[PDB]
């Protein structure tokens, strides 16, 4: 500390966290959503295995989703995913009401199941005593804000930034610099923590953050040409210990 | 771990520790030694303040000490330091017996007071479950081995290496490579921990060790042109936590 100052060398001042599958189980929650739609489609409307086909089709449509706010809102686009999947699978006339019934069961279920764990809450409270905390999350305004509210997590952060609201999102560095200015700190004083190499980690690298930490809960190996983070941990609960160590590097 | 292997990237395999004022309080113990010599010289022989002058003179002689094993052994050289300091201060005939009486009171006191703390013992036991441990200490054979025995610490290590026994000492890299071979590991797999930038840390740097950790208990600032370590901590008790973090760097 005395030494570090002498060297022109900063303690960490802010930590940016990812949201989806870093602090909340979006995959798990979303899967729960699909499970309920299947349960609905089968028990209520007497669909057999083709109920799974519809859900698959929706996952596929979600993953190539192309959202134009000028043209539609997100609820309509997503309800259409379901509407198409249903017709694609069961044929007949477009059935919007059934589409809505699915979309909303899916949405409500997954939001019900997006939660900060008690131990994650406990941590985020500790860290904030010592550093600033900012949530930096990709995605459209409505969907992400709904998520932030569903897991009641905004109170844990000094700021919250949603990519769909900004001119570029992760891994464009502009969004990181925007974050730094919100907090009044420098990129060199900041650590990005998140679960996706091509957004969270690469973004961190693009913006020259002090450090990038990759959460790899399942110990997967990534592809050869992919961005290399500064550290890798299995759990966000390890961050406090790691940050202490980071503050010792010279 | 799965990822790190994929990258060709090693967990730490061995940690080398410094001895003097890293695991035992050599300065404190040695000061205790001088205090007893003063107590002796004053109460027994009725010396006044000049007892402190003698001890100062010995510290000075120790710090510029020039040991030729071909010519003398260490006990004789050091007894001469005292003998000279006494004559320099109180004049008269060289008095070897008084010189010996001092040297041995000093030596016995400081050895009495070189001890591993219970918490340091507890740590070294934990680390060894997970990594190899080697003591790498500068100084003449007899003096250092006497110290190693005095604090009963050899049982905590897989190997113990004394610079005075080797062809070069810290920070010559030859001694580090020698250490690696003793343990059957690579320099890239090893971390040096110690309290002196110009021996422990520089040596680590010269030998390409994975990492060098500087213990700076008192938070002193070093001189501009001095070697920069990889980390700095206030206590060896922090090493376990730090090593975990080191094993996450990519
Ligand atoms: Cl993700
Ligand atoms: Cl399509
Ligand atoms: Cl020293
Ligand atoms: Cl002299
Ligand atoms: Na994510
Ligand atoms: Na030392």
Coordinates of C-alpha atoms and ligand atoms in Angstrom, one line a residue:
Chain A
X1 CA 0.0 0.0 0.0
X2 CA 2.7 2.4 1.0
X3 CA 4.9 0.6 -1.6
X4 CA 2.1 0.4 -4.2
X5 CA 1.4 4.1 -4.0
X6 CA 5.2 4.7 -4.4
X7 CA 5.0 2.6 -7.5
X8 CA 1.9 4.3 -9.0
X9 CA -0.2 1.3 -8.6
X10 CA -3.9 1.1 -7.7
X11 CA -5.9 -1.1 -5.4
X12 CA -9.1 -2.3 -7.2
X13 CA -11.8 0.4 -7.0
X14 CA -14.7 -1.3 -8.9
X15 CA -15.8 -4.7 -9.8
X16 CA -18.2 -5.2 -12.7
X17 CA -20.4 -8.3 -12.6
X18 CA -22.2 -10.2 -15.4
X19 CA -25.9 -11.1 -14.6
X20 CA -27.1 -14.1 -16.7
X21 CA -25.6 -17.4 -15.3
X22 CA -23.1 -15.5 -13.2
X23 CA -25.4 -14.2 -10.4
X24 CA -28.7 -15.9 -11.4
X25 CA -29.4 -19.3 -13.0
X26 CA -31.0 -18.1 -16.3
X27 CA -30.4 -21.4 -18.1
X28 CA -32.0 -23.3 -15.2
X29 CA -34.9 -21.0 -14.8
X30 CA -35.5 -20.9 -18.5
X31 CA -35.5 -24.7 -18.7
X32 CA -38.0 -24.7 -15.9
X33 CA -40.1 -22.4 -18.1
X34 CA -40.1 -24.9 -20.9
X35 CA -40.9 -27.7 -18.6
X36 CA -44.1 -26.0 -17.6
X37 CA -45.1 -25.2 -21.1
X38 CA -44.7 -28.9 -21.9
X39 CA -46.7 -29.8 -18.8
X40 CA -49.4 -27.4 -19.9
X41 CA -49.5 -28.5 -23.5
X42 CA -49.7 -32.2 -22.6
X43 CA -52.1 -32.2 -19.7
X44 CA -54.4 -29.4 -20.8
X45 CA -54.3 -29.8 -24.6
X46 CA -53.3 -33.5 -24.8
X47 CA -50.2 -33.0 -26.9
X48 CA -47.8 -35.9 -26.9
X49 CA -44.0 -35.7 -27.6
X50 CA -44.5 -32.9 -30.1
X51 CA -44.7 -30.5 -27.1
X52 CA -40.9 -30.9 -26.8
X53 CA -40.5 -30.1 -30.6
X54 CA -42.3 -26.8 -30.1
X55 CA -40.0 -25.8 -27.2
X56 CA -36.9 -26.8 -29.2
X57 CA -38.1 -24.7 -32.1
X58 CA -38.5 -21.7 -29.7
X59 CA -35.0 -22.1 -28.2
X60 CA -33.7 -22.1 -31.8
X61 CA -35.7 -18.9 -32.7
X62 CA -34.5 -17.3 -29.4
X63 CA -30.9 -18.0 -30.2
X64 CA -31.0 -16.4 -33.6
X65 CA -33.5 -13.7 -32.4
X66 CA -33.4 -10.5 -34.3
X67 CA -35.0 -7.6 -32.3
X68 CA -36.0 -4.4 -34.1
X69 CA -37.4 -2.0 -31.5
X70 CA -38.5 0.4 -34.3
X71 CA -40.8 -2.3 -35.5
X72 CA -42.1 -4.3 -32.6
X73 CA -41.6 -4.8 -28.9
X74 CA -40.0 -7.7 -27.4
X75 CA -43.2 -9.3 -26.1
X76 CA -44.7 -9.4 -29.6
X77 CA -41.6 -10.9 -31.2
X78 CA -41.4 -13.6 -28.6
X79 CA -45.0 -14.4 -28.7
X80 CA -44.5 -14.9 -32.4
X81 CA -41.6 -17.3 -31.9
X82 CA -44.2 -19.5 -30.0
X83 CA -46.9 -18.9 -32.5
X84 CA -44.7 -20.0 -35.4
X85 CA -43.3 -23.0 -33.4
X86 CA -46.9 -24.2 -32.8
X87 CA -48.0 -23.9 -36.4
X88 CA -44.7 -25.3 -37.7
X89 CA -45.4 -28.4 -35.4
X90 CA -49.1 -28.9 -35.2
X91 CA -50.2 -27.1 -38.4
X92 CA -53.5 -25.4 -38.8
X93 CA -54.3 -21.7 -38.3
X94 CA -52.0 -19.4 -36.5
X95 CA -53.1 -19.5 -32.8
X96 CA -52.0 -16.4 -31.0
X97 CA -53.9 -17.0 -27.8
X98 CA -52.2 -20.3 -27.3
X99 CA -48.9 -18.6 -28.3
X100 CA -49.5 -16.1 -25.5
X101 CA -50.4 -18.7 -23.0
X102 CA -47.1 -20.4 -23.6
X103 CA -44.9 -17.3 -23.7
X104 CA -46.3 -16.0 -20.4
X105 CA -46.1 -19.3 -18.6
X106 CA -42.5 -19.5 -19.7
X107 CA -41.7 -16.0 -18.8
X108 CA -43.4 -16.1 -15.3
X109 CA -41.8 -19.4 -14.5
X110 CA -38.3 -18.3 -15.4
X111 CA -38.6 -15.0 -13.5
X112 CA -40.0 -16.8 -10.4
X113 CA -36.8 -18.9 -10.5
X114 CA -34.2 -16.1 -11.0
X115 CA -32.8 -15.5 -7.5
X116 CA -29.6 -14.5 -5.8
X117 CA -28.4 -17.3 -3.5
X118 CA -28.1 -16.3 0.2
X119 CA -24.3 -16.8 0.0
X120 CA -24.1 -14.7 -3.1
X121 CA -26.1 -11.9 -1.4
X122 CA -23.8 -12.3 1.7
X123 CA -20.8 -11.8 -0.6
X124 CA -22.0 -8.9 -2.6
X125 CA -22.6 -7.1 0.7
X126 CA -19.0 -7.8 1.9
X127 CA -17.4 -6.6 -1.4
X128 CA -19.4 -3.4 -1.4
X129 CA -17.9 -2.3 2.0
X130 CA -14.6 -2.3 0.2
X131 CA -15.2 -1.6 -3.6
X132 CA -17.8 -0.2 -5.9
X133 CA -20.0 -2.8 -7.6
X134 CA -21.7 -2.4 -11.0
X135 CA -23.9 -4.9 -12.9
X136 CA -23.1 -4.9 -16.6
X137 CA -25.6 -7.0 -18.6
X138 CA -26.2 -7.5 -22.3
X139 CA -29.8 -7.7 -23.8
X140 CA -32.9 -5.7 -24.5
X141 CA -34.1 -3.0 -21.9
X142 CA -37.3 -4.6 -20.9
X143 CA -36.1 -8.2 -20.6
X144 CA -33.1 -7.4 -18.6
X145 CA -34.8 -4.8 -16.3
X146 CA -37.5 -7.4 -15.7
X147 CA -34.8 -9.8 -14.7
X148 CA -33.0 -7.3 -12.4
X149 CA -36.3 -6.7 -10.6
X150 CA -37.2 -10.5 -10.5
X151 CA -34.1 -11.3 -8.5
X152 CA -34.4 -8.1 -6.5
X153 CA -30.7 -7.4 -6.9
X154 CA -30.4 -3.7 -7.9
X155 CA -30.1 -2.7 -4.2
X156 CA -26.7 -4.6 -4.2
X157 CA -25.1 -2.3 -6.8
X158 CA -23.9 1.2 -7.1
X159 CA -24.9 1.2 -10.8
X160 CA -26.6 -1.1 -13.3
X161 CA -26.0 -0.9 -17.0
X162 CA -28.0 -2.7 -19.7
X163 CA -26.5 -3.2 -23.1
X164 CA -29.7 -2.8 -25.0
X165 CA -30.0 0.8 -23.6
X166 CA -26.5 1.8 -24.7
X167 CA -25.0 2.4 -28.2
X168 CA -22.9 -0.8 -28.1
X169 CA -22.8 -3.7 -25.7
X170 CA -20.2 -6.2 -24.4
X171 CA -17.5 -6.7 -25.8
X172 CA -17.4 -3.2 -27.4
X173 CA -15.2 -1.2 -25.1
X174 CA -17.4 1.9 -25.3
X175 CA -19.8 0.3 -22.8
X176 CA -16.9 -0.3 -20.3
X177 CA -15.7 3.2 -20.6
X178 CA -19.3 4.3 -20.0
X179 CA -19.3 2.2 -16.9
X180 CA -16.1 3.8 -15.6
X181 CA -17.4 7.3 -16.0
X182 CA -20.6 6.4 -14.2
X183 CA -18.5 5.4 -11.2
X184 CA -15.8 8.1 -11.6
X185 CA -13.0 5.5 -11.9
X186 CA -10.5 4.4 -14.5
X187 CA -10.5 1.2 -16.5
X188 CA -7.1 0.3 -14.9
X189 CA -8.9 0.3 -11.6
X190 CA -11.6 -2.2 -12.6
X191 CA -12.2 -5.9 -12.7
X192 CA -14.8 -7.6 -14.9
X193 CA -16.2 -10.8 -13.6
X194 CA -18.4 -13.0 -15.9
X195 CA -19.1 -16.4 -17.5
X196 CA -18.8 -15.7 -21.2
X197 CA -15.4 -15.4 -22.9
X198 CA -16.6 -13.7 -26.0
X199 CA -18.6 -10.9 -24.2
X200 CA -17.5 -10.4 -20.6
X201 CA -13.8 -11.4 -20.9
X202 CA -13.1 -10.1 -24.4
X203 CA -14.8 -6.8 -23.5
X204 CA -12.6 -6.5 -20.4
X205 CA -9.6 -7.1 -22.6
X206 CA -10.8 -4.6 -25.2
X207 CA -11.2 -1.9 -22.5
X208 CA -7.9 -2.5 -20.7
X209 CA -9.5 -3.4 -17.4
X210 CA -7.1 -4.2 -14.6
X211 CA -8.3 -7.8 -14.7
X212 CA -10.9 -10.1 -16.2
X213 CA -12.1 -13.1 -14.2
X214 CA -13.9 -16.0 -16.0
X215 CA -16.4 -18.0 -14.1
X216 CA -16.2 -21.6 -15.4
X217 CA -18.6 -23.5 -13.0
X218 CA -18.4 -26.7 -15.0
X219 CA -14.7 -26.6 -16.0
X220 CA -15.3 -26.6 -19.7
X221 CA -12.4 -26.2 -22.2
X222 CA -13.0 -23.4 -24.7
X223 CA -12.0 -23.3 -28.4
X224 CA -8.4 -22.8 -29.5
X225 CA -8.7 -19.2 -30.8
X226 CA -10.7 -17.8 -27.9
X227 CA -10.0 -14.9 -25.6
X228 CA -7.8 -15.6 -22.6
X229 CA -8.9 -14.2 -19.2
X230 CA -6.5 -13.1 -16.4
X231 CA -8.0 -15.6 -13.9
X232 CA -10.5 -18.4 -13.9
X233 CA -12.6 -19.5 -10.9
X234 CA -15.4 -22.1 -10.5
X235 CA -17.6 -19.8 -8.5
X236 CA -18.3 -16.1 -7.9
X237 CA -18.0 -16.8 -4.2
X238 CA -14.3 -17.0 -4.7
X239 CA -14.1 -13.4 -5.9
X240 CA -13.3 -11.8 -2.5
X241 CA -10.3 -14.0 -1.9
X242 CA -9.1 -13.4 -5.5
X243 CA -9.5 -9.6 -5.3
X244 CA -7.3 -9.6 -2.2
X245 CA -4.7 -11.4 -4.1
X246 CA -5.1 -9.0 -7.1
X247 CA -4.4 -6.1 -4.7
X248 CA -1.0 -7.7 -4.0
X249 CA 0.2 -8.0 -7.5
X250 CA 3.0 -5.5 -8.4
Chain B
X1 CA -7.5 -27.2 -14.2
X2 CA -9.0 -29.0 -17.2
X3 CA -8.7 -25.6 -18.9
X4 CA -5.1 -24.9 -17.5
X5 CA -3.8 -28.3 -18.7
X6 CA -5.4 -27.6 -22.1
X7 CA -3.3 -24.3 -22.1
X8 CA 0.0 -25.9 -21.0
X9 CA -0.1 -24.2 -17.7
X10 CA 1.0 -25.6 -14.3
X11 CA -0.4 -25.4 -10.8
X12 CA 2.4 -24.4 -8.3
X13 CA 4.5 -27.5 -7.4
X14 CA 7.0 -26.1 -5.0
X15 CA 7.4 -23.1 -2.8
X16 CA 10.8 -22.0 -1.6
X17 CA 11.1 -20.1 1.7
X18 CA 13.7 -17.8 3.1
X19 CA 14.7 -18.3 6.7
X20 CA 16.2 -15.2 8.4
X21 CA 13.3 -12.8 9.3
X22 CA 10.9 -14.6 7.1
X23 CA 10.2 -17.7 9.3
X24 CA 12.3 -16.7 12.4
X25 CA 13.0 -13.4 14.0
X26 CA 16.8 -13.3 13.5
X27 CA 17.0 -9.5 14.1
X28 CA 15.0 -9.7 17.3
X29 CA 16.8 -12.7 18.6
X30 CA 20.2 -11.1 17.8
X31 CA 19.2 -7.9 19.5
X32 CA 18.3 -10.0 22.6
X33 CA 21.8 -11.4 22.3
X34 CA 23.4 -8.0 22.5
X35 CA 21.1 -7.0 25.3
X36 CA 22.5 -9.9 27.4
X37 CA 26.1 -9.0 26.6
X38 CA 25.4 -5.5 27.8
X39 CA 23.7 -6.8 30.9
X40 CA 26.8 -9.0 31.4
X41 CA 29.4 -6.4 30.8
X42 CA 27.7 -3.9 33.1
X43 CA 26.6 -5.9 36.1
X44 CA 29.5 -8.3 36.1
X45 CA 32.5 -6.2 34.9
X46 CA 31.0 -2.8 35.8
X47 CA 31.2 -1.3 32.3
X48 CA 29.0 1.8 31.8
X49 CA 27.7 3.1 28.5
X50 CA 30.7 1.8 26.6
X51 CA 29.2 -1.6 26.7
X52 CA 26.8 -0.4 24.0
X53 CA 29.8 0.9 22.0
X54 CA 31.3 -2.6 21.9
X55 CA 28.1 -4.1 20.6
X56 CA 27.8 -1.5 17.9
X57 CA 31.3 -2.2 16.8
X58 CA 30.5 -5.9 16.6
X59 CA 27.3 -5.3 14.5
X60 CA 29.4 -3.2 12.1
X61 CA 32.1 -5.9 11.9
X62 CA 29.4 -8.6 11.3
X63 CA 27.9 -6.6 8.5
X64 CA 31.1 -6.2 6.6
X65 CA 32.2 -9.8 7.7
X66 CA 34.6 -11.5 5.4
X67 CA 34.7 -15.3 6.0
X68 CA 37.5 -17.4 4.5
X69 CA 36.9 -21.0 5.5
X70 CA 40.4 -21.9 4.2
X71 CA 41.8 -19.7 6.9
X72 CA 39.6 -19.8 9.9
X73 CA 36.3 -21.2 11.1
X74 CA 33.4 -19.0 11.8
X75 CA 33.6 -19.2 15.6
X76 CA 37.1 -17.9 15.6
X77 CA 36.3 -15.0 13.2
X78 CA 33.4 -13.9 15.3
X79 CA 35.1 -14.3 18.5
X80 CA 37.7 -11.9 17.0
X81 CA 35.1 -9.4 16.2
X82 CA 34.3 -9.2 19.9
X83 CA 37.9 -9.2 20.9
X84 CA 38.7 -6.3 18.6
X85 CA 35.6 -4.4 19.7
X86 CA 36.6 -4.8 23.3
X87 CA 40.2 -3.6 22.8
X88 CA 39.0 -0.8 20.4
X89 CA 36.7 0.4 23.2
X90 CA 38.4 -0.3 26.6
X91 CA 42.0 -0.5 25.4
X92 CA 44.6 -2.7 27.1
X93 CA 45.7 -6.2 26.1
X94 CA 43.6 -8.4 23.8
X95 CA 41.3 -10.4 26.0
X96 CA 40.2 -13.5 24.2
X97 CA 38.4 -15.1 27.2
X98 CA 36.2 -12.1 27.6
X99 CA 35.6 -12.1 23.8
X100 CA 34.4 -15.7 24.1
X101 CA 32.3 -15.1 27.0
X102 CA 30.5 -12.4 25.0
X103 CA 30.3 -14.3 21.7
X104 CA 28.8 -17.3 23.3
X105 CA 26.3 -15.4 25.4
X106 CA 25.2 -13.7 22.2
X107 CA 25.0 -16.9 20.2
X108 CA 23.2 -18.9 22.8
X109 CA 20.6 -16.1 23.4
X110 CA 19.8 -15.6 19.8
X111 CA 19.5 -19.3 19.1
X112 CA 17.2 -19.7 22.2
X113 CA 15.0 -17.1 20.6
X114 CA 14.8 -18.4 17.1
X115 CA 11.5 -20.2 16.9
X116 CA 8.7 -20.9 14.4
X117 CA 5.4 -19.4 15.7
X118 CA 2.6 -21.9 16.3
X119 CA 0.6 -20.3 13.5
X120 CA 3.6 -20.5 11.1
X121 CA 4.0 -24.2 12.0
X122 CA 0.3 -24.7 11.4
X123 CA 0.6 -23.1 8.0
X124 CA 3.7 -24.9 6.8
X125 CA 1.9 -28.2 7.6
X126 CA -1.1 -27.2 5.5
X127 CA 1.0 -26.1 2.5
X128 CA 3.0 -29.3 2.5
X129 CA -0.2 -31.4 2.0
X130 CA -0.6 -29.6 -1.4
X131 CA 3.0 -28.5 -2.5
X132 CA 6.6 -29.3 -1.9
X133 CA 8.4 -27.0 0.5
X134 CA 12.1 -26.1 0.4
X135 CA 14.1 -23.8 2.7
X136 CA 16.6 -21.7 0.8
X137 CA 18.9 -19.8 3.0
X138 CA 22.1 -17.7 2.5
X139 CA 25.1 -17.8 4.9
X140 CA 27.9 -20.1 6.1
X141 CA 27.2 -23.8 6.7
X142 CA 27.7 -23.9 10.4
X143 CA 25.8 -20.8 11.3
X144 CA 22.8 -21.6 9.2
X145 CA 22.6 -25.3 10.2
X146 CA 22.8 -24.3 13.8
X147 CA 19.8 -21.9 13.2
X148 CA 17.8 -24.6 11.3
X149 CA 18.3 -26.9 14.3
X150 CA 17.6 -24.1 16.9
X151 CA 14.1 -23.6 15.5
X152 CA 13.6 -27.3 14.9
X153 CA 12.2 -26.6 11.5
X154 CA 13.9 -29.0 9.2
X155 CA 11.1 -31.5 9.6
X156 CA 8.7 -29.1 7.9
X157 CA 10.6 -29.2 4.6
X158 CA 11.2 -31.6 1.8
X159 CA 14.7 -30.1 1.3
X160 CA 16.9 -27.5 2.9
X161 CA 19.6 -25.7 1.0
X162 CA 22.3 -23.5 2.5
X163 CA 24.1 -21.0 0.3
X164 CA 27.4 -21.3 2.0
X165 CA 27.5 -25.0 1.0
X166 CA 26.8 -24.3 -2.7
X167 CA 28.9 -22.7 -5.4
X168 CA 26.8 -19.5 -5.5
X169 CA 24.1 -18.2 -3.3
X170 CA 21.0 -16.0 -3.7
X171 CA 20.5 -14.2 -6.1
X172 CA 22.7 -16.2 -8.4
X173 CA 20.3 -18.4 -10.4
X174 CA 22.5 -21.5 -10.2
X175 CA 21.3 -22.1 -6.6
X176 CA 17.6 -21.9 -7.7
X177 CA 18.2 -24.4 -10.5
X178 CA 20.0 -26.6 -8.0
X179 CA 16.9 -26.4 -5.8
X180 CA 14.6 -27.4 -8.7
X181 CA 16.6 -30.4 -9.5
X182 CA 16.6 -31.5 -5.9
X183 CA 12.8 -31.5 -6.0
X184 CA 12.5 -32.8 -9.6
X185 CA 10.5 -29.8 -10.7
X186 CA 10.9 -26.9 -13.1
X187 CA 11.6 -23.2 -12.2
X188 CA 8.3 -22.3 -13.9
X189 CA 6.6 -24.4 -11.3
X190 CA 8.1 -22.7 -8.3
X191 CA 7.4 -19.7 -6.1
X192 CA 10.1 -18.0 -4.0
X193 CA 8.9 -16.3 -0.8
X194 CA 11.2 -14.0 1.2
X195 CA 11.9 -10.7 2.9
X196 CA 14.9 -9.3 0.9
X197 CA 14.6 -7.8 -2.6
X198 CA 18.2 -8.1 -3.5
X199 CA 18.6 -11.8 -2.7
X200 CA 15.2 -13.7 -2.5
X201 CA 13.3 -11.6 -5.0
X202 CA 16.1 -10.9 -7.5
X203 CA 17.2 -14.5 -7.4
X204 CA 13.6 -15.6 -8.2
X205 CA 13.6 -13.2 -11.1
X206 CA 17.0 -14.3 -12.3
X207 CA 15.9 -18.0 -12.3
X208 CA 12.6 -17.4 -14.0
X209 CA 10.5 -18.7 -11.2
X210 CA 6.7 -18.7 -11.7
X211 CA 6.4 -16.1 -9.0
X212 CA 8.3 -14.1 -6.3
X213 CA 6.5 -13.0 -3.1
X214 CA 8.1 -10.2 -1.0
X215 CA 7.3 -10.2 2.7
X216 CA 7.3 -6.6 3.8
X217 CA 6.1 -6.8 7.4
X218 CA 6.7 -3.2 8.1
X219 CA 5.5 -1.7 4.9
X220 CA 8.7 0.0 4.0
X221 CA 9.3 1.6 0.6
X222 CA 12.5 0.4 -1.2
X223 CA 14.9 2.4 -3.4
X224 CA 14.0 3.5 -6.9
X225 CA 16.2 1.1 -8.9
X226 CA 15.4 -2.1 -6.9
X227 CA 14.0 -5.4 -8.1
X228 CA 10.2 -5.6 -8.4
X229 CA 8.5 -8.7 -7.0
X230 CA 5.3 -10.3 -8.4
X231 CA 3.4 -9.9 -5.2
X232 CA 3.9 -8.2 -1.8
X233 CA 2.3 -9.4 1.5
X234 CA 2.7 -8.3 5.1
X235 CA 2.9 -11.8 6.5
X236 CA 3.9 -15.3 5.4
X237 CA 0.6 -16.5 6.9
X238 CA -1.0 -15.0 3.8
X239 CA 0.9 -17.3 1.5
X240 CA -1.8 -20.1 1.3
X241 CA -4.5 -17.7 0.2
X242 CA -2.1 -16.1 -2.3
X243 CA -1.0 -19.4 -3.8
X244 CA -4.6 -20.4 -4.4
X245 CA -5.0 -17.2 -6.4
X246 CA -1.7 -17.8 -8.2
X247 CA -3.1 -21.2 -9.3
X248 CA -6.0 -19.3 -11.0
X249 CA -3.9 -16.9 -13.1
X250 CA -3.9 -17.8 -16.8
Ligands
LIG1 CL1 -24.4 -16.6 -20.8
LIG2 CL1 -37.4 -19.9 -38.8
LIG3 CL1 17.4 -10.4 6.0
LIG4 CL1 37.6 -2.6 11.5
LIG5 NA1 -23.8 -14.5 -18.9
LIG6 NA1 16.1 -12.9 5.2

